[PDB]
């Protein structure tokens, strides 16, 4: 929704548009861990003017790209009043939590079995209990497929248990198929409505 608001063609930049761009950066940092590049079907000077204006959120993204929660937290404290006129400061905290989650996810792609003590040291946590809680919460949300061994203080990461042999994946593919067929029917209807126009017929005749 934020991306669609960004791509609105406008001859004048407005505050509502400006805030939509700022919220777009925050969600991009949370979800994808980086600012998604604006498309090329684009917009008007909205793009030209906002980027210099929303410099602080780009600065937050830059430090987010450096991947340092300690440095990121220091920047947030430096720019506390800079993000305060947002009616929301939790998004910045959600960005920090997403960075911690992203670091944990990156550990799965690089480790098969990692201890809680080493995990906390790598992502700079206060202790193994916080890492144990963080892994448990992410598994609850369905973001991580791993297992913890409290007897040896180890966390064993695992790949996707989906071998794509269950009927659930087939049903999901069929649902996407139905969505795509409805998409194509709507596209054909719009193309026919386009064909009804006077200008294309005049060019054809």
């Amino acid at each position: 929704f934020y991306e669609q608001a960004i791509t609105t063609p406008a001859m004048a930049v407005s505050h509502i548009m400006l805030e939509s761009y700022k919220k777009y950066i925050l969600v991009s940092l949370i979800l994808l861990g980086k600012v998604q590049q604006l498309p090329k079907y684009t917009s008007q000077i909205v793009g030209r003017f906002i980027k210099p204006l929303s410099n602080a959120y780009h600065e937050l993204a830059q430090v987010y790209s450096t991947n340092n929660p300690s440095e990121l937290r220091n920047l947030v404290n430096k720019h506390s009043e800079t993000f305060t006129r947002d009616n929301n400061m939790g998004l910045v905290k959600q960005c920090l939590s997403s960075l911690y989650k992203k670091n944990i996810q990156r550990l799965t792609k690089t480790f098969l079995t990692l201890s809680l003590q080493d995990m906390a040291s790598r992502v700079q946590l206060s202790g193994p209990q916080e890492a144990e809680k963080y892994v448990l919460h992410m598994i609850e949300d369905g973001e991580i497929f791993a297992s913890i061994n409290q007897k040896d203080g180890m966390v064993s990461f695992h790949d996707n248990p989906e071998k794509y042999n269950n009927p659930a994946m087939l049903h999901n593919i069929d649902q996407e198929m139905l969505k795509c067929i409805e998409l194509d029917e709507r596209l054909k209807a719009m193309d026919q409505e386009i064909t009804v126009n006077p200008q294309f017929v005049q060019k054809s005749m």
Binding site: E3, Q4, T7, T8, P9, A10, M11, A12, S14, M17, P39, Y41, R106, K109, T110, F111, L112, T113, L114, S115, D118, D152, M154, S156, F157, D159, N160, E162, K163, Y164, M169, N172, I173, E176, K179, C180, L183, R186, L187, M190
Partner: protein, 412 residues
């Protein structure tokens, strides 16, 4: 950065192997970057700089030697430049140069292209001896105009290559190497000198893959090439770059097929063992020799910044090849395959996995490095579903764009 402390350099051989302004530059950098040996390096430098009537760099070197001698007069608690040299050097340098200039200008009134080119080359040679870089270039850049034969073009290219190395205009070196090679129909081994100059220029230009390829083609029949680079450093330059860029089969073919780098490896047995140990998966002995090669060759001219990057690449490549034929590779054994500690290797391995090209997973429980062999189909299906989701999102975006354009919705 550099300027580290380390002993055991042989100053006599390194100074005698090179000759010319290249030797002058080598003695200065060695003195400037190797303390506890700068005095003799500067003493030998000034003793050679006063030869061939240097003017400006002599003052810099004499001042540095005066400072160095003053430092020696306070630790175990400054030489005179003999300014009679200034009177003597200037008076001789002017008279011969003016005599040569008078001849060439008269020859310019005689209008002979080769004579003008040869005289300009002589003027450039004198200016380089006098310590006048740009002055030599203009003389050389006027000899380039009056060329008549292919050998004249080759000599013109060699002179510009020589000067632009001192000027650090390596772009002019590479341009003239290309001109000297591609033009005259690609016992007198002339292309070998051009390839040696190109490899040195590329290496100084932060290039390793092409520089090693050019250095490997250099035939040992060139032998004496002290105006640019000694054969001893050429072998080292080729070996380090080949080890960092050339893979195993790439290394084996190129070294053997060239048959001149085998002679080069005979000159430097240390790098020959390093490459051989690299082939035979003995990286423990390979890297310990490399660290021994580090200090002896980090006080090199065009190597010191690049060698650190080259050595870092060598360490990464050695680890990649070592783990390749291993399913359950014990991190203890991999750590034992070098003088590194278990924790240090684990950090190095983790960094390599983050960067890539090792395709492995670290099992810190038993400290065993397990290789990753992901199913192609599962990843294919996952990324195909992601692509379909992105395509649906972009289709929604395009439909919304069409809706807002058809209804003429825009901010006024």
């Amino acid at each position: 950065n550099y300027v580290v402390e380390n002993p055991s350099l042989d100053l006599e051989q390194y100074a005698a192997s090179y000759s010319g302004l290249m030797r002058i530059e080598r003695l200065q950098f060695i003195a400037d970057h190797c303390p506890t040996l700068r005095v003799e390096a500067l003493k030998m430098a000034l003793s050679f700089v006063q030869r061939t009537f240097n003017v400006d760099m002599y003052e810099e070197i004499h001042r540095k030697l005066s400072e160095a001698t003053r430092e020696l007069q306070n630790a175990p608690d400054p030489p005179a430049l003999d300014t009679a040299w200034v009177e003597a050097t200037r008076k001789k340098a002017l008279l011969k140069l003016e005599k040569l200039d008078t001849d060439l200008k008269n020859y310019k009134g005689n209008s002979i292209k080769e004579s003008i080119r040869r005289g300009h080359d002589d003027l450039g040679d004198h200016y380089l001896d006098c310590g006048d870089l740009s002055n030599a270039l203009k003389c050389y850049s006027r000899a380039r105009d009056y060329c008549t034969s292919a050998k004249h073009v080759i000599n013109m290219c060699l002179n510009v290559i020589k000067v632009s190395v001192y000027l650090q205009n390596w772009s002019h070196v590479l341009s003239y190497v290309s001109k000297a090679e591609s033009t005259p129909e690609i016992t007198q081994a002339i292309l070998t000198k051009l390839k040696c100059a190109a490899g040195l220029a590329e290496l100084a230009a932060r290039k390793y893959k092409q520089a090693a390829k050019c250095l490997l083609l250099a035939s040992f029949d060139h032998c004496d090439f002290p105006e640019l680079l000694s054969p001893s450093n050429v072998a080292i330059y080729g070996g380090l770059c080949a080890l960092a860029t050339f893979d195993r089969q790439e290394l084996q073919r190129n070294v053997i097929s060239s048959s001149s780098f085998k002679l080069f490896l005979e000159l430097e047995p240390q790098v020959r063992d390093i490459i051989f140990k690299f082939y035979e998966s003995k990286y423990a002995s390979c890297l310990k020799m490399l660290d021994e090669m580090k200090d002896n060759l980090l006080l090199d001219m065009y190597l010191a910044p690049h060698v650190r990057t080259l050595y870092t690449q060598i360490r990464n490549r050695a680890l990649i090849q070592y783990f390749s034929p291993y399913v359950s590779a014990d991190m203890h054994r991999m750590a034992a395959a070098f003088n590194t500690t278990v924790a240090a290797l684990e950090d190095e391995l983790t960094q390599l996995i983050l960067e890539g090209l090792i395709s492995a997973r670290v099992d810190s429980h038993s400290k065993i490095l397990y290789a990753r062999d992901v199913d192609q189909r599962s990843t294919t299906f996952e990324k195909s579903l992601l692509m379909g989701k992105e395509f649906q999102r972009r289709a929604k975006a395009m439909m919304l764009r069409a809706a807002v354009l058809r209804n003429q919705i825009h901010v006024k």
